[PDB]
Amino acid sequence: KQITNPYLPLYEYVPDGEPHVFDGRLYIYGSHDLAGGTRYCQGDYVTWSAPVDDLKSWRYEGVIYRKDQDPLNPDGNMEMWAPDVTRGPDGRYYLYYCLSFYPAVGVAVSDSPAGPFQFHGHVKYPAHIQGGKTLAEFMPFDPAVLTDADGRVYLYYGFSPVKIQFSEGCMTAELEPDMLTVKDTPKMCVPGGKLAVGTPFEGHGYFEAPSIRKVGEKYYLLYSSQLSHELCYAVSDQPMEGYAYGGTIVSNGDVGLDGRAAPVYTLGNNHGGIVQAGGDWYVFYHRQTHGTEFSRQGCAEKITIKPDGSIPQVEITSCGLNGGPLAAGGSYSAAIACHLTDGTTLREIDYSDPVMKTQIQITEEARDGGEDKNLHYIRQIGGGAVVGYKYFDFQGVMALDLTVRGDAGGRLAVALDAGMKQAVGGADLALNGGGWQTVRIPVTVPNGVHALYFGYTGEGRLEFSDFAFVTA
Ligand SMILES: [Ca+2]
Ligand SMILES: [Ca+2]
């Protein structure tokens, strides 16, 4: 069996995923994008899970909570954004979420990690602070919750941009066992970008998307930084104070990795956390598709937590949860690319830029039958474009069968590096119609593990749906 990135099937769009192991299964609790979506998080919340010892087998557990279950949202006019789920000290499962830019944290509850969740309440002040009202201060946003090893419960939230009233950083408070009532007014624990100036956090301040995990006895607080495309971490010995800046864990364009400035893949917001599954640690994040920020898909990479507690930045890959490189036999969707750029790939996220519409991008097209019949492919491939995959175990590979279409007149080169300097083969591209076709490209690749890159040079545009390995 094999698994790639994204780990859920290509017709599923679960960004903002919080990974938790419950009763032997790794559940992912994210928001819910739609293919071709026109706004953030348009679907009801679902969950998917794999056995914790076999992360290559994900199954769909259904919708677990709907937009209209919150009393603030009777017509479902507002979306539900990035959630978190904790097993509370009472043994039940508590789901925390905010409606789209609504300044309250809602809470639902179930006895099962797969639902059904029923509305529980809104996070609120105790009777003696602010008349016990619903918490609406310091911009409630992107909630994350920890049920600690001793049974205490801590909430983390906030929205702190640098670009009404917003957060100065990540805010935090301990909740009572009702899972609604804070023990005290929330306080800041990680500085936002503004307050980050002068600190070790400088340039990587808190922006959104906290995720709290226990690593041994330590508290690891991940967040999406002011850069938005990266996930950073801070570490403390205490849950609500004393956080020291860690570093970057993952960027969805590998920005920052080895000082890289030009992204390897279209940048966008990023959300997620770490999890211990098997004997290893993973980071879950999401990627962008469709040339927008509204069709996002969960990905993951193994990480290493060093003996001193630090977590070096990891590169994005196509094999993610596979536990090793993929087989260089059989057929693959082009949509599992972890490298995807052209001459318009932006260094600064800007989804208003009209160049996004005509940029190289992964898209989906509904087809007769099930979602598994839907076509995924890369469109808008022109000269200067590069498409890349990590990693394959090449054994006796003689050729590649590329399924393409379009009106392109030029050269498709094949290489093992993104700079296209380790060239292993190439094809003349003579297609000026509009029906799919397979092109065999002979390649001289020595056996062993390699990345795989396709580079296009010339005029026209092409679309790329699948590639297959031709072995001896
Ligand atoms: Ca879906
Ligand atoms: Ca979250």
XYZ file of C-alpha atoms and ligand atoms in Angstrom:
474
model
C 0.000 0.000 0.000
C 1.071 3.563 -0.681
C -0.011 7.058 0.300
C 0.930 10.473 -1.055
C 0.359 14.136 -0.218
C -2.416 15.288 0.114
C -3.191 12.260 2.344
C -6.972 12.416 1.869
C -8.286 11.665 -1.653
C -7.864 14.355 -4.297
C -11.609 15.149 -4.333
C -11.561 16.070 -0.616
C -10.640 19.560 0.659
C -10.009 19.681 4.436
C -7.715 22.599 5.357
C -6.888 23.803 8.890
C -6.587 20.225 10.132
C -5.841 19.479 13.787
C -4.455 15.926 14.153
C -5.447 13.902 17.240
C -5.107 10.211 18.112
C -8.310 8.929 19.740
C -8.881 5.264 20.567
C -6.160 4.060 18.208
C -7.042 6.187 15.204
C -5.560 9.430 13.939
C -8.461 11.794 13.276
C -8.003 15.044 11.378
C -10.326 17.881 12.463
C -10.143 20.674 9.895
C -12.540 23.051 8.207
C -14.102 22.079 4.856
C -13.277 23.649 1.491
C -15.030 22.820 -1.797
C -13.403 22.229 -5.153
C -13.597 25.465 -7.066
C -14.784 27.123 -3.875
C -15.413 30.868 -3.948
C -14.849 31.548 -0.222
C -13.229 29.986 2.809
C -14.620 26.864 4.441
C -17.963 26.526 2.657
C -18.823 22.963 3.778
C -20.005 21.436 7.053
C -17.327 19.898 9.288
C -16.264 16.340 8.413
C -13.651 14.070 9.892
C -11.417 11.353 8.423
C -9.228 8.878 10.303
C -6.552 6.239 9.810
C -5.395 3.534 12.255
C -2.566 5.094 14.182
C -0.224 2.291 13.073
C -1.311 2.481 9.370
C -1.473 6.099 8.238
C -1.856 5.042 4.598
C -5.514 3.985 5.012
C -7.822 6.974 5.572
C -11.582 6.545 5.809
C -14.359 9.128 5.791
C -16.349 9.307 9.043
C -19.078 11.663 7.728
C -20.235 15.162 8.639
C -19.831 15.722 12.393
C -21.310 19.225 12.937
C -23.227 21.680 10.752
C -23.169 25.433 10.254
C -26.712 25.979 11.531
C -26.267 24.193 14.871
C -24.782 27.308 16.508
C -27.587 29.540 17.858
C -25.825 32.558 16.329
C -26.149 31.074 12.814
C -29.723 29.833 12.345
C -29.833 30.283 8.554
C -26.290 28.985 8.154
C -25.346 32.328 6.584
C -21.941 32.267 8.290
C -19.304 29.640 7.636
C -17.555 27.652 10.344
C -13.799 28.215 10.324
C -10.755 26.333 11.673
C -11.826 24.011 14.549
C -10.088 22.003 17.265
C -11.221 18.922 19.186
C -10.053 17.764 22.623
C -11.016 14.825 24.806
C -12.094 16.675 27.946
C -11.423 15.601 31.528
C -14.932 14.101 31.602
C -13.989 11.712 28.786
C -16.187 13.390 26.178
C -15.054 15.140 22.992
C -15.342 18.931 22.812
C -15.183 20.796 19.488
C -14.134 24.487 19.462
C -14.747 26.792 16.497
C -15.560 30.354 15.413
C -18.111 31.419 12.841
C -16.634 33.509 10.038
C -15.074 36.546 11.743
C -17.621 36.351 14.537
C -16.116 37.421 17.857
C -17.170 34.383 19.923
C -15.843 30.856 20.410
C -18.561 28.222 20.047
C -18.385 24.749 21.582
C -20.041 21.420 20.707
C -19.793 18.042 22.418
C -20.011 14.331 21.597
C -19.206 11.014 23.263
C -17.448 9.794 20.073
C -14.520 11.290 18.118
C -16.670 10.848 14.946
C -19.704 12.712 16.343
C -22.516 13.522 16.293
C -21.585 16.794 17.996
C -24.309 18.842 19.695
C -23.980 22.531 20.523
C -22.599 22.876 24.046
C -22.218 26.621 24.644
C -20.102 29.679 23.936
C -16.875 30.401 25.794
C -17.868 32.872 28.481
C -16.557 34.879 31.391
C -17.140 33.706 34.968
C -19.983 35.363 36.873
C -17.581 37.829 38.549
C -15.803 39.116 35.387
C -17.758 41.245 32.905
C -21.099 39.984 34.193
C -20.297 36.490 32.960
C -20.956 37.528 29.368
C -19.872 35.652 26.277
C -16.170 36.145 25.587
C -15.838 38.656 22.758
C -12.518 40.359 23.558
C -9.106 40.253 21.851
C -10.637 39.023 18.550
C -11.687 35.393 19.175
C -10.258 33.500 16.226
C -8.751 30.120 15.317
C -9.346 28.357 18.654
C -7.035 25.628 19.925
C -7.486 23.731 23.209
C -5.339 21.482 25.396
C -6.543 18.992 27.954
C -3.301 18.700 29.935
C -1.895 15.537 31.536
C -3.263 16.685 34.915
C -6.774 17.307 33.577
C -6.681 21.086 33.313
C -7.941 22.728 30.115
C -6.278 25.684 28.327
C -7.634 27.708 25.414
C -5.496 29.556 22.829
C -6.875 31.960 20.227
C -6.364 35.228 18.376
C -5.950 37.095 15.086
C -2.982 39.504 14.828
C -2.275 40.931 11.364
C 0.474 43.441 10.599
C -0.477 44.505 7.052
C -12.644 46.205 14.541
C -10.130 45.466 17.342
C -7.629 42.645 16.768
C -5.237 40.623 18.912
C -1.829 41.813 20.013
C -0.731 38.182 19.994
C -1.881 34.698 20.893
C -4.334 34.921 23.800
C -4.826 32.184 26.363
C -6.918 31.266 29.401
C -7.666 28.200 31.501
C -11.209 26.891 31.182
C -13.330 25.418 33.968
C -14.452 21.760 33.601
C -17.688 22.917 31.997
C -15.407 23.572 28.972
C -16.990 27.028 28.599
C -16.029 29.299 31.498
C -12.565 30.888 31.670
C -10.820 31.104 35.018
C -9.546 34.610 34.227
C -9.261 37.251 31.511
C -7.237 35.820 28.590
C -3.609 36.934 28.415
C -1.042 37.140 25.631
C 1.524 34.328 25.389
C 3.222 34.806 21.976
C 3.747 38.314 20.545
C 2.175 39.304 17.262
C 4.349 40.756 14.520
C 4.226 44.317 15.884
C 5.112 43.411 19.464
C 7.516 40.822 18.030
C 9.920 43.566 16.938
C 12.846 43.544 19.340
C 12.253 39.973 20.499
C 13.584 36.560 19.454
C 10.178 36.195 17.708
C 11.020 39.160 15.446
C 9.899 38.653 11.856
C 7.978 35.472 12.786
C 5.366 36.835 15.183
C 2.035 35.218 15.912
C -0.645 35.843 13.305
C -3.285 33.082 13.632
C -3.827 29.325 13.847
C -2.455 28.233 17.248
C -2.092 24.502 17.894
C -1.032 23.264 21.340
C 0.660 19.923 22.007
C 2.415 18.226 24.887
C 5.872 16.902 24.009
C 6.919 14.865 27.025
C 6.467 17.413 29.805
C 6.960 20.484 27.577
C 4.368 22.711 25.906
C 4.784 23.198 22.157
C 2.663 25.977 20.687
C 2.548 26.033 16.891
C 1.141 28.984 14.990
C 0.908 30.540 11.551
C 3.341 33.446 11.594
C 3.066 36.941 10.120
C 4.386 35.297 6.916
C 1.117 33.222 6.953
C 2.535 30.515 4.677
C 4.701 28.993 7.431
C 4.015 27.169 10.687
C 6.293 28.212 13.558
C 6.625 26.898 17.101
C 7.468 28.174 20.556
C 8.266 26.042 23.601
C 7.594 26.548 27.292
C 7.627 24.623 30.552
C 4.212 26.179 31.350
C 0.988 26.254 29.326
C 0.079 29.940 29.472
C 3.403 31.764 29.895
C 7.131 31.514 29.336
C 7.176 30.733 25.620
C 10.552 30.921 23.863
C 10.676 31.132 20.059
C 11.535 27.884 18.274
C 11.682 28.318 14.520
C 9.945 27.437 11.287
C 8.587 23.904 10.972
C 7.157 23.967 7.440
C 6.281 26.477 4.729
C 3.875 25.377 2.022
C 6.318 26.830 -0.494
C 9.480 25.862 1.443
C 10.229 29.557 2.054
C 12.911 29.837 4.693
C 14.204 26.332 4.047
C 17.977 26.626 3.674
C 17.474 30.353 3.241
C 15.188 29.844 0.234
C 13.333 32.989 -0.892
C 11.551 31.903 -4.098
C 8.748 29.435 -3.257
C 8.733 25.930 -4.736
C 4.904 25.879 -4.781
C 2.111 28.450 -4.714
C 2.020 30.200 -1.349
C -1.061 30.769 0.776
C -2.193 30.566 4.335
C -1.153 27.554 6.391
C -2.738 25.913 9.438
C -2.117 22.749 11.467
C -0.078 21.101 14.201
C 2.150 18.226 15.196
C 1.145 14.788 16.414
C 2.827 11.701 17.814
C 1.678 8.644 15.837
C 3.498 5.351 15.802
C 6.852 6.109 17.330
C 7.313 9.222 15.147
C 6.218 12.853 15.028
C 4.466 14.426 12.043
C 3.490 17.951 11.031
C 0.122 18.449 9.303
C -0.352 21.570 7.155
C -2.333 22.377 4.024
C -1.621 23.317 0.442
C -3.389 25.633 -1.985
C -4.953 24.652 -5.325
C -7.113 26.119 -8.101
C -5.195 29.402 -8.142
C -7.234 30.559 -5.130
C -7.112 30.320 -1.344
C -10.443 28.467 -1.224
C -9.618 24.883 -2.348
C -7.081 23.739 0.192
C -5.907 20.221 0.967
C -4.218 18.668 3.974
C -0.654 17.432 3.723
C 1.831 16.039 6.233
C 5.534 15.331 6.713
C 7.507 13.337 9.232
C 9.572 15.599 11.494
C 12.466 15.116 13.899
C 12.433 16.576 17.398
C 16.119 16.731 18.325
C 17.385 15.737 21.798
C 17.525 19.449 22.745
C 13.845 19.932 21.838
C 14.365 21.849 18.603
C 12.521 21.002 15.378
C 14.442 21.741 12.138
C 12.406 22.902 9.146
C 11.255 20.131 6.817
C 10.687 20.322 3.068
C 7.287 19.623 1.554
C 7.068 16.306 -0.328
C 4.746 14.193 -2.474
C 5.215 11.063 -0.345
C 4.453 12.537 3.119
C 2.891 9.804 5.252
C 4.279 7.001 3.068
C 7.205 6.234 5.379
C 9.627 6.221 2.448
C 9.834 7.172 -1.213
C 7.171 5.991 -3.610
C 7.534 3.051 -5.986
C 8.820 4.007 -9.437
C 6.290 1.696 -11.024
C 2.650 2.182 -11.884
C 0.736 5.373 -12.572
C 0.459 8.645 -10.646
C -1.804 11.688 -10.742
C 0.059 14.865 -11.703
C -1.948 16.580 -8.896
C 0.378 15.171 -6.160
C 3.110 17.577 -7.282
C 5.024 19.226 -4.450
C 6.830 21.528 -6.882
C 4.674 23.799 -9.070
C 5.964 27.141 -10.410
C 6.150 29.388 -13.437
C 7.466 32.894 -14.131
C 4.413 34.422 -12.405
C 4.760 32.527 -9.101
C 4.471 35.217 -6.439
C 6.914 35.658 -3.577
C 4.352 37.612 -1.533
C 0.888 36.101 -1.123
C -1.631 38.214 -3.071
C -4.834 36.498 -4.171
C -6.231 39.694 -5.668
C -3.478 39.653 -8.308
C -5.102 38.841 -11.695
C -2.073 36.700 -12.555
C -3.468 33.967 -10.311
C -6.200 33.135 -12.818
C -3.744 32.224 -15.580
C -1.031 30.747 -13.348
C -0.018 27.087 -13.411
C -2.319 25.385 -10.935
C -3.929 22.111 -9.886
C -7.648 21.917 -10.645
C -10.499 19.402 -10.500
C -13.249 18.669 -12.999
C -16.332 16.696 -12.014
C -16.918 13.596 -14.100
C -19.732 11.119 -14.503
C -20.157 8.883 -11.495
C -18.436 9.242 -8.158
C -16.027 11.831 -6.823
C -13.369 9.175 -7.459
C -14.168 9.585 -11.168
C -13.429 13.309 -10.989
C -10.480 14.405 -13.075
C -7.569 16.165 -11.417
C -4.827 17.719 -13.519
C -2.407 20.618 -13.748
C -3.489 23.330 -16.151
C -1.977 26.572 -17.477
C 1.503 25.145 -18.106
C 3.565 27.484 -20.294
C 7.212 28.164 -21.020
C 9.360 28.547 -17.936
C 7.038 26.251 -15.956
C 8.344 23.393 -13.789
C 6.436 20.532 -12.119
C 8.214 18.320 -9.588
C 7.750 15.306 -7.307
C 9.546 13.981 -4.205
C 10.592 11.138 -3.909
C 10.662 8.033 -6.098
C 12.711 4.866 -5.729
C 13.955 4.400 -9.300
C 14.782 0.782 -10.109
C 15.233 -0.042 -13.782
C 13.154 2.897 -15.011
C 13.466 3.148 -18.806
C 10.783 5.701 -19.717
C 7.882 7.870 -18.521
C 4.357 7.916 -19.985
C 3.036 11.473 -19.639
C -0.679 12.082 -20.272
C -1.012 15.633 -21.624
C -3.125 17.870 -23.861
C -3.203 21.444 -25.120
C -1.700 23.577 -27.874
C 1.978 23.553 -26.911
C 4.879 23.725 -29.324
C 8.104 23.194 -27.502
C 10.252 21.040 -25.294
C 9.386 19.048 -22.206
C 12.558 18.343 -20.243
C 12.934 15.788 -17.438
C 15.352 16.317 -14.556
C 16.067 15.242 -11.001
C 16.478 18.782 -9.627
C 14.264 21.855 -9.710
C 17.006 23.798 -11.541
C 16.606 21.353 -14.428
C 20.390 20.902 -14.627
C 20.382 17.148 -13.948
C 18.641 16.371 -17.223
C 17.674 12.723 -17.793
C 15.480 12.899 -20.905
C 13.188 15.117 -22.910
C 10.464 15.219 -25.527
C 9.397 17.448 -28.383
C 5.881 18.650 -27.618
C 3.768 18.764 -30.787
C 0.118 18.903 -29.735
C -2.313 21.509 -31.065
C -5.808 20.170 -30.439
C -7.490 19.372 -27.147
C -7.741 15.643 -26.426
C -5.678 13.758 -23.849
C -2.721 11.722 -25.116
C 0.205 9.745 -23.726
C 3.806 10.595 -24.635
C 6.584 8.155 -23.839
C 9.786 9.918 -22.811
C 12.901 7.714 -22.459
C 14.996 8.529 -19.400
C 18.452 7.522 -18.195
C 18.113 7.612 -14.409
C 20.509 5.591 -12.230
C 18.861 3.396 -9.627
C 18.181 4.915 -6.228
C 15.999 7.577 -4.650
C 15.410 10.766 -6.667
C 13.145 13.748 -7.056
C 11.486 14.066 -10.475
C 10.938 17.296 -12.410
C 9.272 18.238 -15.692
C 10.200 21.568 -17.273
C 8.459 23.154 -20.259
C 10.108 25.473 -22.795
C 8.392 27.071 -25.758
C 5.040 28.512 -26.721
C 1.460 27.570 -25.947
C -0.062 26.060 -22.842
C -0.459 22.430 -21.855
C -2.367 20.440 -19.259
C -0.882 17.438 -17.448
C -3.062 14.777 -15.815
C -0.990 11.632 -15.088
C 2.414 10.048 -15.430
C 3.455 6.402 -15.270
C 6.770 4.610 -14.911
C 7.938 2.255 -17.677
C 10.351 -0.333 -16.286
C 12.280 -3.280 -17.696
Ca -15.565 17.519 0.697
Ca -6.788 25.492 14.454
